[PDB]
Amino acid sequence: GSSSRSVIRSIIKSSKLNIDHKDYLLDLLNDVKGSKDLKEFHKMLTAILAKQP
Hints:
This is Phosphoprotein. This protein has 53 residues and is mainly alpha-helical.
């Protein structure tokens, strides 16, 4: 997968993120606009799991 929305959402829904956090990341991810903006989303996403257990 090369920066696929379907591939990303799958990681969030599967991730152990807060029910409210996931819903937010998935809600915004669906209405994501801009290649550069979409990339930044991943930068923070990984940061979440990076800290997770």
